[PDB]
Known about the structure:
There is one protein chain. By secondary structure, the protein is mostly beta strands. The strands form 4 sheets. The chain has a 14-stranded mixed beta sheet with strand order 2-3-5-8-11-15-18-23-26-29-32-35-38-41, with no helix packed on it. Strand 2 (15-21) and strand 3 (24-29) form a beta hairpin.
Amino acid sequence: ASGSPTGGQIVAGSGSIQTPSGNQMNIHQNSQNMVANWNSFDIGKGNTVQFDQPSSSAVALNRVVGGGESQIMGNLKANGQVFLVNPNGVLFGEGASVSTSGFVASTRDIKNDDFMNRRYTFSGGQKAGAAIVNQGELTTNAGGYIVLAADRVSNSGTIRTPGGKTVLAASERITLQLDNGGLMSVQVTGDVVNALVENRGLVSARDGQVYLTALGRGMLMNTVLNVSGVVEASGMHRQDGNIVLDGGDSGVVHLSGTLQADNASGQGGKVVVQGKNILLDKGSNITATGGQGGGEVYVGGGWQGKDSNIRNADKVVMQGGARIDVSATQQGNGGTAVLWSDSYTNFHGQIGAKGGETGGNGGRVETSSHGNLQAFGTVSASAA
């Protein structure tokens, strides 16, 4: 645990490093893509690391080749984009602030040549027990992205990617395709033992998208994806989903917090919750309401499990006191809410799909299973 990154050297691209003076380290970048290796990459409280980059779409890769888990307690700022790779993991402290146009923290490595060719695929080299934990504040400029990729990813603080994307991913491999400085798409493949993505804090991608994906192996009923806080992607409805949870083909996806994709001045967003076993616990709240129309919430599959782009669950359990709301609030039709499984759907919660107060028809709700169905909750899908 040091106060500032040390042992830095530019090994690809063109740039310069200045050690701390006045509690701030300055890293200047000349090329569009730059690689710096670091003995360590810690930032103490009250200290800043400032990247001065040629373009908001420039990328600096920072690889820790020393031994310690990165301790980021102070500030990291950049006008462009920053990748931080540490096989031993990263902790962002309660006071930490990271503010960039796009930020990746990964325990999986990337090859220098791939990165300098703008082929952003990360895999291999992680140490056993390495996690990425955020207890501070990670934020990007509008349209940027934040990607945290490790065997275990935990957010108890705040992540904000307005008009952009947040991706928390526990997988063996992750590939980022960037388009004009924005995150165009993400592919995650390969299972990881004890894979875990947990959000006790706040993830907010206003007018953006949040994607949480954990791929474990042989969990039985160990949790792979746990959201006890708030995931919010209010704004324009997106066909590919405003909030997408994917627990893979093993383990439990547990929601006790809130997934929020509302749109007071339009149609509600789309929330997709996938996994093998999904538990919507008491107090959980999935809301995709819209002033001009309700949104779509799919838990365990699409309508009757016939959406190839949504994984079909084996079991879905919605506890009493859990709620889903796809209502239209002002004018327009209620949205669509689906609980689906292949083997067992136990519905004890509340699903709302009302039409607008000033007009509109009730929405469409399905609580079903290819196998066993226990439907004991409440569904309100009526006009006002």
